[PDB]
Amino acid sequence: MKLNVDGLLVYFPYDYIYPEQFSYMRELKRTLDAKGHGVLEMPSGTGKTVSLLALIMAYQRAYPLEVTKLIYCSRTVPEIEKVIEELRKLLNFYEKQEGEKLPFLGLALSSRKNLCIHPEVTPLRFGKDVDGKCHSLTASYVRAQYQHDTSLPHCRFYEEFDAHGREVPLPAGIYNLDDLKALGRRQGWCPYFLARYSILHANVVVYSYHYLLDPKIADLVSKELARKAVVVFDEAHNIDNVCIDSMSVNLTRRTLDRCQGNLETLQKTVLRIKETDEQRLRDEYRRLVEGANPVLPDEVLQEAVPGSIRTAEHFLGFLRRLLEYVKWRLRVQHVVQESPPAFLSGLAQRVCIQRKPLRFCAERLRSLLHTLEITDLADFSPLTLLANFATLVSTYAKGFTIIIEPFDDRTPTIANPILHFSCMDASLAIKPVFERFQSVIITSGTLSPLDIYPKILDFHPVTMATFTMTLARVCLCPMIIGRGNDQVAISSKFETREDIAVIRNYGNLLLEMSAVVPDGIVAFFTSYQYMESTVASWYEQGILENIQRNKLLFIETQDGAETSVALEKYQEACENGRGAILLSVARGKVSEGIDFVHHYGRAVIMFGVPYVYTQSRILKARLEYLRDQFQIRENDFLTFDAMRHAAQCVGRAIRGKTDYGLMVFADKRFARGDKRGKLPRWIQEHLTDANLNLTVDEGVQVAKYFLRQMAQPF
Template sequence: MKLNVDGLLVYFPYDYIYPEQFSYMRELKRTLDAKGHGVLEMPSGTGKTVSLLALIMAYQRAYPLEVTKLIYCSRTVPEIEKVIEELRKLLNFYEKQEGEKLPFLGLALSSRKNLCIHPEVTPLRFGKDVDGKCHSLTASYVRAQYQHDTSLPHCRFYEEFDAHGREVPLPAGIYNLDDLKALGRRQGWCPYFLARYSILHANVVVYSYHYLLDPKIADLVSKELARKAVVVFDEAHNIDNVCIDSMSVNLTRRTLDRCQGNLETLQKTVLRIKETDEQRLRDEYRRLVEGLREASAARETDAHLANPVLPDEVLQEAVPGSIRTAEHFLGFLRRLLEYVKWRLRVQHVVQESPPAFLSGLAQRVCIQRKPLRFCAERLRSLLHTLEITDLADFSPLTLLANFATLVSTYAKAAWTPRWPSNPYLSVSSLSSSHLGHCPRWTSTPRSWTSTPSPWQPSP
């Protein structure tokens, strides 16, 4: 079916269109014409995905200089696959109507867990284990060692992609995750890095919210995407939760205990490196003096996760002298760890603003705000310098470093109108089995909430 949507020729791959779909297309075209933001809503099951794809693909073909790319963000892998299949039907309809194959590329991108085809990695169940194993096979220093000793473990799929995959662009067509994995097996190329490389020249990219909203991932994957791209968030009411999750860190006592083990391992590694290759630590110190931008200029395989949210101006600065050397930085992390452990010994609920937390940190263990901002990037640099291959083992310490960077970068506390402006005191029964059983005292605002142990009334 061919439609005229306010002067724009739109190919629609079905024989019938709902009136709501046509209205949806008209509103979407007005949004694109205005070069602004739009919030559009349709009931479930009325074909909003195909309507959106049909309109934007037609707009791309009519105004190639205005809209260079469509970035479609969805929540889950099944939803991503559904969008790709709708896009495949649409492209097939275009080619059937015009009688020729179009130079159009659309693809899905997901995590290594969903794209890796290496036989040693695919059996792993958890994403962080897959990422860690991938890094242990593709890091630049691992590959350099392989050049001298071919018996060392490596990833032949990434080696083939690095040698030949960048020279040959991905053929035109629509690729879901299984298509990318099948192509990777045929060519001997890594599907994950092939997809990451191909999104730069793809017409349509479909991936998760996190690739655009989570700073730790977006800085590695989406940083180079064209500014004239149209971004679509499917089920946009989930954006708030995704942003909150991306900028939140939860530390438990078990995590902190594992941090202690990480610090001891790093301490032993630093001592060993000082005895065998001290120049490596000196080179890192020089890079940190020059600034984090230079220190973080690593190959794509070395960047496991970017820093959580460091502003660009911070990356231009030199790392504070108190954490430049490896020994000083590990001592810094040890003091931070002990303070956080001490804070978790409380038996009641405590909520405070970031400035209050930083003030207590400075008073008790003499840690200032500025070096905390560099924690995540400094730890990443140290792990790279020490040539740590299995980064999954150091995820607890990475979590602590991310916490330090976040709490020191954003000092303004959040506010939500759901919180009452006037404090109140209440007593609540937590059980209906006995009148007055287990009351709880609650006081708001949440900055001072106290929950004593339950008590039983005297008989």
């Protein structure tokens, strides 16, 4: 299937493409031709990936100099595996068409924890542990000692890679993570480091955001080599939250105590080092005078001189001083306090800690800790976190804020206070991506309206188009139910949350919808506490028992183990005729991680508009700062945060292969024009005024009829 695109001719593996695919390809080619960053939305979970990859490959063939390589990022490794599968299929199709191999390379990066071949680190699954063990095995000290070949466990894979892969790079091919593990085992090399080196000469590289956003690890692999590369973020509508998380650092009392203990161990190790080997490790002082990774981005990062902290004892005392200041500032009992610049000024005044020497604290920590030949960085990781916070605060506070919480939420009195350093704007941390890369395409599904995104992230988009899925059959038939059998408002307002009548309306709607809907249904609440309250009310009444009789019921919990077990049983229930009703939370990690396909989550129920609690002070900074700068109304951003989240958690049923399914929102708020307008275009256009505010019974009847229509073949 060769498509004569306006720009050029583009190959395509599958037989047919919908008109939305034509529109997507033409808009994407327009953006690439303009060589300017832009954002676009595509409904389908799958199909957009193949269209995007094919268009990028064809554009690379036409103008190889224009684009050096493609950097395609996905939320999670399980998801990016499907992307690499799609890319492998596309490459096989293109190779068959051409008749021969071409110099094209495509690979996926992942954590050493996820992929590695060392038996010692295999049993351990904790990422910091894998990082520390690998650092110990690959340490420059361990490498030098391996040169001596003394009796000591040395990781042969990295040494063999240094010997061989450095000389010879991999010719070409596509390697999934699992297949790359096998390749590393066969060749006695690192599946991780081999891909890391191939990044220098790779046409396509795929990895999650935290491999491309956080300055600590993103920069090293996203160096200026890709000066003009097509960087693409997929389903990255929750990009602001992850970009903020890449900067926010949380300091707790327990973490601070662990830091103090680690610092004591550091002092003891320094004394032992002084008595054992002093001159050779002192040479570090000379190289320092000449002049865990830094959190400072490219331009913000500075390397002039370490500062007044030039020796191990001096640096240790500096950390003692700063840790004492943080300890006391956290121990203070008072209302939540915000102080971005005032915190730095007060630190400098109270404990005599100048911001410039504080700036290089984390970098000097890395160097000095390397000198100590520690067993691993896992033990001292809390200290490195505190050092990263210490350097960040002295680095900048223009678009940041230090929040102190002596008392935690959900606890009238708790002896574990927490100090947050949550960011307020993601533009600060995502600026390097936009500036360095010629064009970035934020391709997303279920995207709340694009107009806000340029305001939140400071960039000038080239194209702003919303693509609506078009099929010969109406795959999706969304509806909103606001009126119950009692013709009573069913809005899940904070003041209306306690309403037993509203809870009863929700329960009855779920009962009837489970009675009619086939096997497999997922209901998303607004919070764990609200979900528990509704479940308890239904349990006190007989509605819950009737729902249990009609279909099996499963519930989500904060604990990941129970969540995984419940979802595993839910899948088997969906396969069998019992069916299942999975209650979950919109913010739950399960909602974002899981993907619902044919005969999975057939009818997506949304109980109440997803709104975060109006007491969490972090969101207060994040929100009022957006009001002050970029001029976004607080209500506007709040409703946007609700609609984007709801679209994320309701857009799964249309994953791909044209699998029918209905999305019912049991809240009259969605019927409001603003919510509908902010809803994604593809869902909204299907939505109509006739079914906009169906009663519970009317919605049930129309759902039954729509399921009848979708049951029959094409």
